Design a protein around this ligand. Structure first.
Ligand code: NYR
Ligand code: NYR
Lengths: 304, 304
């Protein structure tokens, strides 16, 4: 028993990290097969960042200007291309540590593990959620760009995020592995609105089920609610509206605990209206929304 | 910027995990050089667990009774010995993925990363603290025994914990890699007192410094305190007494922020006496004690 903000084991991803330098800028790259993927802003100088013309900046670069190093050994770049906000550097050697992988675009509210890197070397791993407004609340310093987010299913790594930027508000923005930003963000040093965020209701409910499974049950009450009534409360508290698709996803947890989804909604409604009264749930004094229903089942069942 | 409960990259440890089976029991083992380390209770049946005579139980086992598998390949056991609560199975092959390593005994209040495993395969990684009462609040199901806790400094993995047991209270207990339990615990299926725990004061202060570095400063006040006055409050609130050795350890964070340690103590005193008033610090509604001062500096400086 016990419930932790658990990340996927990072070994398969560590084997893909490389350093990419172009001119004066160094960041991380992801080496899969014979391609190294990295943020395109590796080609900018500080003077370019206010509004870079990436097409023009890349035209001044040749393959030999992209210094790619995997540990202590240099990789030979035999092609480069820009796809959206990422550069793809073709190298002459396939990464011998390439795991089985996919590139996926995750939905807002889904979670993933980030392997934070600097200079092509790993610093640490942590789990986070893609916020409903497509930002991430990570731990990323300058030099962390090119660090990636991922999930694993058995032996397959699904890469979903590449880090590009910290907005002036201190939250993070990045792309899928095809270089498309999540959200309205652009890779330039400007203030950019992230827009209204909300709490991931289906994840808070999953985490309440995790709390029941792990012995924390004080918040269970004698009440029930309906999707309509619960959604009036979710509206008031800036929570995402709950749908039958979310209730369906919570089915396995409802079956395991014997607690109907709408009964757990009524527990959540009371917690929103009354607060925790100085009490905690799974070591937290707030309602946690960074565990999906799949995360809860995976952690509570010991999937490897 | 941003501050997360970050674990060390787990790749070097993943390469050491193996499955150990003895009779009907399967758990994890740690393969370093030509030795596999695992909890000695792998030799027990359920009927033995109430009060096992480990010496007698081990006398009934031979090398060939310890089935050790590293991925899909079997390891050949050429010796076995019990050291405290661990078994050391000598194998005929040195682990080719053995990283540079040390076995260390950590102090209460220190943190480490756990790579939770089942059947010799990794499930996930998370960061936690060794509580002042020598328990850990982990995420461990049956089958997770033999999962290890560790820290990394550059290329050296310091193993500090091996998981052995979940007490009836749902908290976890284990040993150093020499098999000595942390705390008063014994490897048997009995109720066992953990004794009074306390909050790790030096870590809460480090985390408040992390909050200031990462922009959360609402809790800073116009006050100061003394070690004596602060410790009267720490006593009331079940916090560890702060010493000059803790103030010295917080020196680098005090230098970086310009906030004297006793001034941060006065902020902590006010938070203890008044609570958070519905506010948060680094996304938490409670005072967090699972980051050491070294963890804060490492994360805020991007050590790899
Ligand atoms: C401080 C930090 N954390 N994670 C990345 C950074 C550096 C950073 O924000 N770079 C940046 C800023 C604006 C635009 C673009 Cl494309 C990149
Ligand atoms: C449920 C769980 N989590 N982590 C380990 C377990 C299984 C467990 O508690 N085993 C156990 C119980 C008593 C004594 C001994 Cl030595 C071992």
């Amino acid at each position: 028993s016990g419930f932790r903000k658990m990340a996927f084991p990072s070994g398969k991803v560590e084997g893909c990290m490389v350093q990419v330098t172009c001119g004066t800028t160094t960041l991380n790259g992801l080496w899969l097969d014979d391609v190294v993927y990295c943020p395109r802003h590796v080609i900018c100088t500080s003077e370019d960042m206010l509004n870079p013309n990436y097409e023009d900046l890349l035209i001044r670069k040749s393959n030999h200007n992209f210094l790619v190093q995997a540990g202590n050994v240099q990789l030979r770049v035999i092609g480069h291309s820009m796809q959206n906000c990422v550069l793809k550097l073709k190298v002459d050697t396939a990464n011998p540590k390439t795991p089985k992988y996919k590139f996926v675009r995750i939905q807002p509210g889904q979670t993933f593990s980030v392997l934070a890197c600097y200079n092509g070397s790993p610093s640490g791993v942590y789990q986070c959620a893609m916020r409903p407004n497509f930002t991430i609340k990570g731990s990323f310093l300058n030099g962390s760009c090119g660090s990636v987010g991922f999930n694993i299913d058995y032996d397959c790594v699904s890469f979903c995020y590449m880090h590009h930027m910290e907005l002036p508000t201190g939250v993070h923005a990045g792309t899928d592995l095809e270089g498309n930003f999540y959200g309205p963000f652009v890779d330039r040093q400007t203030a950019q609105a992230a827009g209204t965020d909300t709490t991931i209701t289906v994840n808070v409910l999953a985490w309440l089920y995790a709390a029941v499974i792990n012995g924390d049950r004080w918040f269970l009450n004698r009440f029930t609610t309906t999707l309509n009534d619960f959604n009036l409360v979710a509206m008031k508290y800036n929570y995402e509206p709950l749908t039958q698709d979310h209730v369906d996803i919570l089915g396995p947890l409802s079956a395991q605990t014997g607690i109907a989804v709408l009964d757990m909604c009524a527990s959540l409604k009371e917690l929103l209206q009354n607060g925790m009264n100085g009490r905690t749930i799974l070591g937290s004094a707030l309602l946690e929304d960074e565990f999906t229903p799949f995360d809860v089942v995976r952690q509570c069942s010991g999937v490897t």
